[PDB]
Amino acid sequence: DLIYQDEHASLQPLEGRTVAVIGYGIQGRAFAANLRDSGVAVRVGNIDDRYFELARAEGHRVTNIAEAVAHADIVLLLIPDEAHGAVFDVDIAPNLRDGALLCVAHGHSLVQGDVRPLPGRDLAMLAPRMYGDPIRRYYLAGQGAPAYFDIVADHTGRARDRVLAIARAVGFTRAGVMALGYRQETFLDLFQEQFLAPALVDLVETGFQVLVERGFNPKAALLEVYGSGEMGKMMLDGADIGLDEVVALQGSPTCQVGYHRWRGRTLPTAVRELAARVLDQIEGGDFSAYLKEQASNDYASLDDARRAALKRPLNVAHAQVRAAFRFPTEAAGGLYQAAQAPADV
Amino acid sequence: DLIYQDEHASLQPLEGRTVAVIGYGIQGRAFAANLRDSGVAVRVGNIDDRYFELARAEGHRVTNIAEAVAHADIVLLLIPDEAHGAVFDVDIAPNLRDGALLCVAHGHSLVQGDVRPLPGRDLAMLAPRMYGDPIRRYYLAGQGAPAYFDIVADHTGRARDRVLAIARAVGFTRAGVMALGYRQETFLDLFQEQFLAPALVDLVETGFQVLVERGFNPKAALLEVYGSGEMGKMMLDGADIGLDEVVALQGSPTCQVGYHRWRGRTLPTAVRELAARVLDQIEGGDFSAYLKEQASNDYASLDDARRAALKRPLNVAHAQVRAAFRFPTEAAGGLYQAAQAPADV
Ligand SMILES: NC(=O)c1ccc[n+]([C@@H]2O[C@H](COP(=O)([O-])OP(=O)(O)OC[C@H]3O[C@@H](n4cnc5c(N)ncnc54)[C@H](O)[C@@H]3O)[C@@H](O)[C@H]2O)c1
Ligand SMILES: NC(=O)c1ccc[n+]([C@@H]2O[C@H](COP(=O)([O-])OP(=O)(O)OC[C@H]3O[C@@H](n4cnc5c(N)ncnc54)[C@H](O)[C@@H]3O)[C@@H](O)[C@H]2O)c1
Ligand SMILES: [Mg+2]
Ligand SMILES: [Mg+2]
Ligand SMILES: [Mg+2]
Ligand SMILES: [Mg+2]
């Protein structure tokens, strides 16, 4: 495995270069803020929507996508994957300078052939293993999350150095940036989002629903299954030292005995078989067809699903718990500004 | 629901009083450190083992359990639940002063009748919804985790004020301290440890095993299922704003569409039915019998299970990942000392 940390990547390839962050959403905002705070010349390219004014409000040089690309040495395409094809064809390909680098943060558009190599220009993937807020929060703490990278086309011979320079400036090399094919990254990423994340929340919800049906205080039930932050803490501490190890070190003997009675015995074959089906639907292109269909609207069915989700007993109970119990939040005040808001006492 | 935050609980009931922390383990150490830093007079009562010298090393007045109880107004029994009966009968009951308060952090010993009310003395439960390290780390950040409390016996009329004074000093009232019966707390707590925690780790492991069997990079597979910290971050951010809400706010449209394709559809009836069985085994006293049997040895079978757990593919892969990727850790240097170690650069 090829893994780069801070000492394996220089900022020198970005000196006197301009990085165009295309999009100012979940990833675009975090990339833009970290690049700027790392002393990189950054511009934002964005369509005429709320994100354009947000980028301006947070002190960035903002223009349409075409002008940003045309005045950039490195272009980071940080907009939704189903929009890549149209923006690549219309905005990026006609304006990408000779010897410039285009990066995606997900391999989907590469697998589908919506983003393709261009003569005289570099193409790469730099895919964070983390969402926007934590990438920004970690960065401010001198930390970072891992990333996968893939050099798809290196026409200049500088593609790797520039990608790893972006990675260090955004903070991914503080954890590690591992070489992984865009195809494998695509399937990995989609599998986490389609099998693991839903199954994980479904499980928490099953815990809540059984407790409430059996007459347990709904606030207490919600708190134990995730609301307290304890299961989230176990998973984040587990990420560091191992999940079984967290229980061995911080579980009472009563907890450890209970845990190890059921550890490896809880799930039937049907869960493992569902994981295989999700993966086949991802690899076979069934999901890709489903996604394109959902993106045919402005994600109308997704909007309905999000709304319906919040009416579920678990999310009704959550609102009641979070109203009654204060949570240890890190204030988001000017998190993506050059200077953050005064600390909230 | 009766929930106390900082403004509903005074430190005044602890002024000129001594708190004996019995045990200096996962909970005992966090209680002792927070109480001291909150300006409470704290002593440690502990048997002649490694925890005794650790308490002394961290600057505490440490004696045997009998002497600590005898010189205390409030006694916190923070040792394993199966040891409560013998320590109550031998060390606590004969030495508990007139008008003194005994607190447990779990209702198990109360349900089993191993800890019982005593004439002229107060009995209560103050059960944190969090393990030791995070209680201490939250406290240092001016934060806290929730707790459940139950006044089992109030012979003085001061039991509630003293319990909630302990809760505020240790930091639980920064989130909220909710009245909940020791019995219900017992079953809730055991259910989280026996159904949810194992099922959660089993699920993560199922994700890892299917990916590795299907030819995915084992480091990448491990990172996606928890190793990156992303799923842990989703769960901890989810604790605050809701699990579905985290995906709605920080998920890409591709992620959100994938998530909502499978959300509420991933688990068969068998999982829900297993949750019911675990709960019946807890409520019926089957687990209690199993626990007493495991505690008959010095938890010998648990030691074997912990050792075996670390040899599993997931934990072998974890060691390889954590060697190759740096994780954003909060340094544990003198975390439980009056003054913490110099910040690790
Ligand atoms: N560990 C947690 O995260 C947690 C959370 C909530 C509730 N609790 C409750 O808190 C209590 C303490 O659990 P813990 O996890 O801190 O335990 P632990 O395993 O860390 O306990 C070790 C401590 O107990 C003492 N001890 C062990 N066996 C003893 C014995 N036979 N006689 C006397 N002292 C003995 C040791 O000297 C040491 O001080 C239990 O009632 C538990 O259910 C623990
Ligand atoms: N969100 C994450 O946590 C995350 C993590 C890793 C990878 N990624 C990848 O990063 C990329 C960005 O995802 P995101 O989550 O930041 O997205 P997002 O949903 O926040 O994207 C919103 C942004 O995209 C722009 N945009 C939306 N539709 C557009 C269109 N039709 N034409 C032009 N611009 C348009 C908006 O103007 C705004 O700037 C995707 O390739 C995604 O797969 C995201
Ligand atoms: Mg991802
Ligand atoms: Mg417990
Ligand atoms: Mg507990
Ligand atoms: Mg994704």
Author numbering:
A (entry chain A), B (entry chain A): 3 to 347
What is the paper's account of this structure, in its own sentences?
A sequence similarity search using BLAST predicted that BurG belongs to the family of ketol-acid reductoisomerases (KARIs; EC 1.1.1.86), well-characterized enzymes that play key roles in the biosynthesis of branched-chain amino acids. Biochemical assays and a suite of eight crystal structures of native and mutated BurG with bound analogues and inhibitors provide snapshots of each step of the complex reaction mechanism, involving a concealed oxidoreduction and a C–S bond cleavage.
BurG was incubated with 8 and NADH and the light absorption of the dinucleotide at 340 nm was monitored spectrophotometrically. A clearly observed signal decrease corresponds to the formation of NAD+ and glyceric acid 9, the reduced form of 8. The transformation of rac-12 into the trapped enolate 13 provides evidence for an intermediary oxidation during the catalytic cycle of BurG. We obtained similar results in co-crystallization assays with BurG, NAD+ and the substrate surrogate hydroxypyruvate 8.
